[PDB]
Glucan 1,3-beta-glucosidase A (Aspergillus oryzae), 386 residues
Amino acid sequence: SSFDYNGEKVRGVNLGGWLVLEPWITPSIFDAAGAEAVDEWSLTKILGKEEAEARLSAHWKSFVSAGDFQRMADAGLNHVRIPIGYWALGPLEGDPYVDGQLEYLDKAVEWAGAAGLKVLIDLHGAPGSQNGFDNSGRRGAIQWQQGDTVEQTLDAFDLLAERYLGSDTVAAIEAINEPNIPGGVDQGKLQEYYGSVYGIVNKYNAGTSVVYGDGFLPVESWNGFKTEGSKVVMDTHHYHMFDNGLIAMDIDSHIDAVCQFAHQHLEASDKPVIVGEWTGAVTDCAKYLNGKGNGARYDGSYAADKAIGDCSSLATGFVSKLSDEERSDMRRFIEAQLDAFELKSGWVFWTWKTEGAPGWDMSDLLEAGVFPTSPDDREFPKQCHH
Ligand SMILES: OC[C@H]1O[C@@H](O[C@H]2[C@H](O)[C@@H](O)[C@H](O)O[C@@H]2CO)[C@H](O)[C@@H](O)[C@@H]1O
Ligand SMILES: OC[C@H]1O[C@@H](O)[C@H](O)[C@@H](O)[C@@H]1O
Ligand SMILES: OC[C@H]1O[C@@H](O)[C@H](O)[C@@H](O)[C@@H]1O
Ligand code: NA
């Protein structure tokens, strides 16, 4: 009942890199700490607790203001998805992580409310790492579900729910970002964690929707699990640069793949489905996207046999430096995604703000006239239909 996921379209952005730092979103912060600083875990460990609190709190305070939220509303959005790590609820004994993020999430909920936006809180990192990505807090291993990690996840989730779910601004809360089933996360144990998260949400505020990631399975494979109308929302992430088939496509083929995704997957789900992450980029050229120290599929330097093209132009900077045809093709890709993802329950762009990652930065694309500001703001014919 906070938001009608069944009947109204989500139009959102992510605050990636804010309360869970990521090297590609703020490379300057990781590069200032040297070559071993490759994720939030290693960054805080290298700085130590005092200096980590100093540097990360300067970022938490400067990266987001009420003005960000006002600009999001002025762009036609109704949602903001906010990643937070388990360590924001108190680092475990021995973790290098610092806390303090809750003070800033508290401001976001107030600022979102003032701007007329809903907040979707996203538990983006779990003890042991649910995916092995740097964006979980610690790259290189999937240890979530070993030891007491799941109980520790539920302890953190419970504190987070207590603090926030009583606000009607917090319309929805996500169990865990990108639990990596193909990477070894056990689906049966994930479903048990999902059931416990639902129980937590309904202890405090039945009006708040529960959001479940598809775990990289087809989102329609979750049919028959917690099917409850507006109450339970699936979150699928749609990207064209992490797959060696999609990354080889031309712009027309990219647009075809987006419509095919909406028809085969979004329209096949028995629940509301948000595309809770997607972007304007069609390459993996952004500096450190595959991890600090790692290259790109697109130029043959990461997980690849051959270069498709060169990453010099798309690694860094802002879209004003590209050609008119490059900006035009990026907008065609974005409009196709807006229209395809609104066939089902809507969308949440990744991400609001970067240090310059062409096609990834909504605040950049909006100002450049690349990102549409309403469903009627279209420069190209509608590319996907019912
Ligand atoms: O999209 C699934 C795919 O991801 C690979 O990890 C990515 C991760 O998804 C991305 O979010 C992060 O920024 O970079 C890494 C490396 O590209 C993963 O290694 C694959 O096994 C998986 O198929
Ligand atoms: O690496 C690109 C993006 O991929 C998504 O799968 C993750 O949830 C983000 O945290 C990340 O920034
Ligand atoms: O690499 C991740 C991608 O792989 C494809 O199988 C899916 O269609 C996308 O939705 C997903 O983002
Ligand atoms: Na709520």
